[PDB]
Design a protein around this ligand. Structure first.
Ligand SMILES: Nc1ncnc2c1ncn2[C@@H]1O[C@H](COP(=O)(O)OP(=O)(O)O)[C@@H](O)[C@H]1O
Ligand SMILES: [Cl-]
Ligand SMILES: [Mg+2]
Length: 307
């Protein structure tokens, strides 16, 4: 079937290419972050990295809200003020909202509408589209595309993980090449291109406070995650030399409703999972900083949108 999903996608894109479908424009600058495949690609992390670059602007992130308990357009946080449970928001928007005390977050299937409500209520100076590469109906002033090595040899859904053919790389203004710290790769296209690394430096307790890895020594952990790809987390742990006695691989966006930790055991998971387990005392998350090659170049490129 990957050949008529593909027909549909190609058709859709041609329509947008030729100007047969409406592209709408918000009255402030819009940066899109997205990728080409299902299965995680550093999008959420990159969006948080980006919001941080723009710390001197009023920033609003526009997200779709992936499997949440709420409908329509929803304000998740107002410049840091959380306003819904993580269930109501979707885990990614909530995580962003939580780790970015200075940013607003809006969840909306129709991103343009989300932007309008945000303008009305938050007067942001810049929008970041969380996962907005395929949402061509909303105009973006800077279209950033994340690629991981794996995408390069993947194929269209349902056969493979690609939501669109690799040729659609042409729609990007800038490419970000992710997971360099675990799957390095090069990719030259003549477009502005930036390698993204994750520096795994820190450990969080379940109240989102930094703690030394000191608790991990000469202790084997039970690790788990519910991510786009649990495999890369599992590998990061091995590369870090963290002793992992067991690994539980949960579905992306897993709700942990039936999760009950065993007494005396220590659990290691990600911030994306941890938001759903706040207060469980023996559960920790591996945390990291995002670092971009040629950050200075990315900045000049980003600030062009304000002129
Ligand atoms: N190797 C990892 N180490 C720590 N946290 C991770 C790791 N991989 C993913 N995460 C968590 O999951 C979030 C990203 O979700 P994921 O499903 O990997 O991809 P995407 O952002 O493309 O949806 C990150 O912000 C981080 O909180
Ligand atoms: Cl990530
Ligand atoms: Mg995701």
């Amino acid at each position: 079937f990957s050949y008529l999903y593909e027909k549909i996608i190609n058709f859709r894109n041609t329509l947008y290419d030729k100007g047969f479908l409406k592209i709408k424009k918000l009255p402030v600058p819009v940066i899109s972050v997205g990728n080409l495949s299902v299965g995680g690609s550093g999008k959420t992390s990159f969006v948080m990295y980006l919001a941080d670059l723009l710390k001197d602007k009023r920033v609003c992130i526009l997200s779709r809200g992936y499997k949440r308990k709420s409908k329509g357009t929803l304000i998740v946080s107002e410049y840091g003020n959380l306003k819904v449970s993580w269930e109501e928001a979707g885990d990614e928007p909530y995580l962003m909202a939580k780790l970015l005390p200075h940013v607003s977050v809006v969840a909306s299937e129709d991103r343009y509408k989300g932007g309008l409500l945000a303008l009305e209520k938050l007067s942001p100076e810049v929008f970041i589209l969380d996962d907005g590469f395929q949402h061509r109906k909303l105009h973006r002033d800077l279209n950033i595309l994340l690629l991981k090595k794996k995408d390069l040899k993947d194929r269209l859904l349902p056969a493979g993980n690609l939501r669109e053919p690799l040729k659609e790389i042409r729609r990007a203004d800038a490419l970000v090449l992710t997971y360099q710290e675990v799957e390095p790769f090069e990719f030259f296209t003549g477009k502005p291109t930036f390698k993204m690394f994750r520096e795994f430096c820190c450990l969080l307790n379940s109240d989102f406070e930094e703690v030394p890895f000191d608790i991990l020594k000469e202790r084997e952990v039970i690790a788990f995650s519910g991510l786009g790809d649990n495999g890369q987390f599992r590998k990061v742990l091995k590369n870090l030399g963290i002793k992992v006695k067991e690994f539980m691989s949960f579905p992306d966006h897993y709700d942990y409703s039936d999760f009950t930790p065993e007494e005396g055991e220590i659990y290691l998971t990600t911030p994306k999972d941890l938001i759903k387990l706040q207060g469980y005392e023996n559960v920790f998350a591996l945390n990291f900083k995002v670092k971009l090659e040629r950050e200075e170049k990315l900045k000049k490129l980003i600030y062009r949108i304000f002129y």
